[PDB]
Amino acid sequence: TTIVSVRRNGQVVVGGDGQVSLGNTVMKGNARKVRRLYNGKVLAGFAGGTADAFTLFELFERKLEMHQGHLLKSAVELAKDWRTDRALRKLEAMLIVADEKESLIITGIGDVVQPEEDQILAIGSGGNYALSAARALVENTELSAHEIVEKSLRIAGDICVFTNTNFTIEELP
Amino acid sequence: TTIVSVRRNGQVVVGGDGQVSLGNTVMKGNARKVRRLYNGKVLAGFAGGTADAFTLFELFERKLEMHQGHLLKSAVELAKDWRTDRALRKLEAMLIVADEKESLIITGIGDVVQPEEDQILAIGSGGNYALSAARALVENTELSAHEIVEKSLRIAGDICVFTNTNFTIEELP
Amino acid sequence: SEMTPREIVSELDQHIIGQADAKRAVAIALRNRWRRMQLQEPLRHEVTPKNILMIGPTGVGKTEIARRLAKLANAPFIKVEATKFTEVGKEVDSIIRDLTDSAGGAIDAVEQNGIVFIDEIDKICKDVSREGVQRDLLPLVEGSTVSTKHGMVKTDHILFIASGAFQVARPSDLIPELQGRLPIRVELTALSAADFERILTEPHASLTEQYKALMATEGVNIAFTTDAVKKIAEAAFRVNEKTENIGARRLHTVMERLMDKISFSASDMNGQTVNIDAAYVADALGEVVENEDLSRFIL
Amino acid sequence: SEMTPREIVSELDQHIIGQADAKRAVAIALRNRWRRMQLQEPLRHEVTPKNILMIGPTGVGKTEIARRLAKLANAPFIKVEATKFTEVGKEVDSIIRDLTDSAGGAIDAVEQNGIVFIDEIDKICKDVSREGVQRDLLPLVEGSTVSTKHGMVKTDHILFIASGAFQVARPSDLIPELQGRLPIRVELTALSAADFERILTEPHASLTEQYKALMATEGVNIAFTTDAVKKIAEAAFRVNEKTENIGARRLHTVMERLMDKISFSASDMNGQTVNIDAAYVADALGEVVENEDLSRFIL
Amino acid sequence: SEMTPREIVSELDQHIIGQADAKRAVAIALRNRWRRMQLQEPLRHEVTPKNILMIGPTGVGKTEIARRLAKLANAPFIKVEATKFTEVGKEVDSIIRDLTDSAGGAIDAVEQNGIVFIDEIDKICKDVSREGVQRDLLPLVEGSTVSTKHGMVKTDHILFIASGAFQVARPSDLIPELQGRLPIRVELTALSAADFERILTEPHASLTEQYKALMATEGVNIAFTTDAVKKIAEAAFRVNEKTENIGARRLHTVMERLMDKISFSASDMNGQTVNIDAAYVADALGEVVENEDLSRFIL
Ligand SMILES: Nc1ncnc2c1ncn2[C@@H]1O[C@H](COP(=O)(O)OP(=O)(O)O)[C@@H](O)[C@H]1O
Ligand SMILES: Nc1ncnc2c1ncn2[C@@H]1O[C@H](COP(=O)(O)OP(=O)(O)O)[C@@H](O)[C@H]1O
Ligand SMILES: Nc1ncnc2c1ncn2[C@@H]1O[C@H](COP(=O)(O)OP(=O)(O)O)[C@@H](O)[C@H]1O
Ligand SMILES: [Mg+2]
Ligand SMILES: [Mg+2]
Ligand SMILES: [Mg+2]
Ligand SMILES: [Mg+2]
Ligand SMILES: [Mg+2]
Ligand SMILES: [Mg+2]
Ligand SMILES: [Mg+2]
Ligand SMILES: [Mg+2]
Question: Does domain A1-173 have CATH number 3.40.50.2300?
Answer without folding.
Answer: no
